[model samples]
Target: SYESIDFFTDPSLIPDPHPYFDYLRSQSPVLRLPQYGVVAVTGYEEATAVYKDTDSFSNCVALGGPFPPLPFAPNGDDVNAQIDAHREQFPMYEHMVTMDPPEHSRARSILSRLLTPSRLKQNEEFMWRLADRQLDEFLGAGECEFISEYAKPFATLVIADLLGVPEDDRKDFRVVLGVNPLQWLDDKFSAYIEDRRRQPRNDVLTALATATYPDGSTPEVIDVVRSATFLFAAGQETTAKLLTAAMRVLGDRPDIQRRLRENRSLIPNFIEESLRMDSPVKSDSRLARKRTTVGGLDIAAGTVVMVLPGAANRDPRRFEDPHEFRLDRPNVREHMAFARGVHSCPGGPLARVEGRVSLERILDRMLDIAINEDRHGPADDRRYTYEPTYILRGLTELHITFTPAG
Candidate 1:
């Protein structure tokens, strides 16, 4: 009695998936999509149920692919042990998001130490200056492409600083990584890791280089590089998307914008509300490690489950008027934009700081900021499209015009 829909191949659904997700949530919280052999969990309760029950589910399919165990992946009852045994064979084996605990715990601990309270405070202070510096480039132009001109560079530079990449070496980050942000951390950071290991410095990269595993073994250069790369790339993409979505909301809703401009302190809530409304990482995939039941639906072992954070955030059961964006939404932070539980995004605080800082600067420097009707058409006729991917959600580009507040 489930609707057979192909989310993976449907081009139309990529731009707007809320309708489909709503239909799924209405029918049942969990619906098995025969196309991918994946159970799409749309309700808040069902999504959290999967996150909480880690024993029955595994992060092996977090990257999202066809189920029934790939040729390279080890198959067994003990998914964690299988992963540990074949860790080196997996491409993202060292990345925390792809690994199960004890391995995930170890990787997370190392990264956590690098992003300490004092360090984050330092990054926060640095972000205000960085945001202003980025704005300086196009503030005089009166109009700009928000994504490439401001959002992308601002996020990339902040993350580069977080990882303690040398100022001289920072310019090459985008060039080296190209469009696929997560492709080559080991190659990009290899030299820095080697240098930090050989001649230690009082910076974050050195901390990463010297950090030990849970067993007290020193992490290899590639290990540190993998973690740093994941942090840098993940933070860059998600934070940029957050800024784009926030700005889009501001452009579309003049009343909300005026209210925020009057009370600048409301900007933080505005950002949180934007996250709840349009989550950047729409959905993440998980594989069933054993036969289990989620939301009264039987999930056989080896079945891939798609956890829809986008849908869960908009679930009417949890959020009041879920589709309506309210600046004073009581539980705005409850949204799973950064996900939930152990594998939740570690870069969340930094992303929030970046979003808040960037918005603050934009609001300060620009006056009468609105979307460029010439490029985007009138409000009623506006047709904004999103990235054509099932996992990520963000505008491809946002063209906007504004007058300098000066």
Candidate 2:
């Protein structure tokens, strides 16, 4: 199916990619798109290979494709110019996901200090408490839209807490993230950043407001905002997808649900399994800084490469019976829901904790969960859509109905 499916610019494959992935892996671990001047690494080893070799494959790219600019920038103009304009804004944003070497190390160190084990545990406790309240508030409503009412809010609140965003500004934080300009391709994205920059608050905004360089001089507050916004937007999108995907999978597999319910301690395992089954962020782009050999394929300098984690996570070479979602799947945490190498998700620990806590609380309170097979709807609805972006794979909405556990 993937052989017939042109992934270069196809939105059709976004709904389901496994068939295409299998086909791609059969052909070659690495896919070269001559028309697009890039390579898509579909196999697990291949994807991980390139991901681990950031020295050969750099992440300085803006990640958005050569698509036209969005409506938010001074120019709804050429793509290159728009990418250039926006790229310049993230220097100190040389943070974990898009950076390398000394800068990435320093930024990750700062974030890690703020997001330690004790802090994660405390946040987990706080999240479970919130989930409990939300469950109580929504129980027995017969049918609840799980995405808006639960998953999004849960992710939003947890990330807010992790970033030390103030309780009062949490609502605004959610609003700003909910309306991610990155979703748009034009000036609108820039305008949204400008808006956030203009009316700064006292939360992570304050932290970024006071962030400094190694030289002790303060960095631009806009840089801090940009980085914070990246986390808020990227983190929220993927975690929300993971939450809904987990719910969908568990709802479909009652045995797995029961396994998790009976073994309350298996919440962490379930989260990992869900990640393996369906990573929220599917693919990432990198630029080849020099000639490189990856996954046994050779490429020259300045080539564009896409590490397709969605396909890689399912590569038969990496996992036995990769299609099946097993809560007890050993080493499921090894999956690249968060990528690998220098760009490995700095938010990994926090996201894992949040997923575990969210699911644990849901299972603790949920009585019945199953897919609504008869309620067929358009598969591509935006409010309930999967990201159409080539780089991100996640649900726009996941609706569910549940009864509180008696």
Candidate 3:
């Protein structure tokens, strides 16, 4: 039993999880935690295999508890049935992440239109301006908390524009949605969805409000809201964290910052490396739909299997010098940070645009940007901490200071 190594309940592991993930990866690819009735897939190949095997694993457990099934769910309970019974209880249950194909394929196709290459190309141009606009509020001050002051709002507004939230309604969304934009799914966007439905405008909202399944069936308002919620929340939170992680690395390694400033072409790789080193969404769960073997371990039906992107991204077998952060890492994009297979994150391109644009603007306008050692600690002995959660991984706040470039 892994009760002694309880990842679900341990607070100490939140700050530095690499050691634990390293330990798990060294063990067999699939390690069973009988106390939690769960199997953790830590190796890169093991995780990839599980992610690709949709037939044997069902994502219906994606929204439920990670280790032990929900308290209400009995042993051997059908995960899909349990989730369907309580779908309305949690709005995210209706999201694409909780679905499996061909249902997933239909929903993903409709949503993919919103993030198509052309759409993201248009969004890319807007993100540059959005990044600058957000910097305007704090760049003049020479110092600010990077997370809330810039990254959070910048990512939120980009998704807001993507959702085609009217300029007039954005201020309302800013206040209501705030950091957790998923709240929009909880009846907050009802009026907006209705408005788009009644008068189909030339905007993403209209597309979402009237989008149909592959069979040409119009989805429910809640369904539209669920997808929209996933877009806004998933898009905003991860990009915000990505920006913070990039800045943290820049502040720590002035050499890397100088190199990036000298040669801007490496910015994209830098972002990829940051994502590889510290994934925003660390891990997700799946349920065994049938008895199967993964990484030489036999998993029974109804078993909860935790997939560790954090571990896989840093597997020594997959990445040489996995612990080091190097912009020159040629295979950085291979990391499982955005996941893999059908459930791979659709917002990945948009997130990259946000990260690159934000980094570019910050580097262009700010001089000698570095972490505030007075507030935090010395660079050698920094006291950085992340959000206290088993799933999402990001800094609570990043105190940084820089002089405005003339």
Best-first order by TM-score? 1, 3, 2
Residue-level lDDT of model 3, residues 1-406, one tens digit each, is 3337788778988998888888777777689864577798888999999999998887776644463345345346345565446544542556788787776876676686578777778888988888888889988889999999998888888888887778897777667766454554456667778888899888877777887888888877876776776777677778888899999999999999999999999999999999999898877888786778999998877788888888888889889999999988988989888888899888888888788889999999999999999878999999898998888889999999999996
Model 3, which residues run further than 4 Å from truth?
1-3, 71-91, 179-188
TM-score of 1: 0.93
Off by over 4 Å in 1: 65-69, 72-91, 174-184
Output the better candidate (1/2) by lDDT: 1
Report the Cα lDDT for residue 42, model 2. Answer: 85
Worst lDDT run of 10 residues, candidate 2, spans 69-78
Show the lowest summed lDDT stretch of 10 residues, model 1.
Answer: 67-76
lDDT of 3: 0.81
Using Cα atoms with residue i matched to residue i, what is each candidate's TM-score against the true structure? 0.93, 0.81, 0.93
Root-mean-square deviation (CA) per prediction: 2.5, 6.5, 2.4
Tens digits of per-residue lDDT, candidate 2, 272-380, equal 8888878877767776666778867777665667777878888887788899887667768778878887777878887787778878878777777765544534323
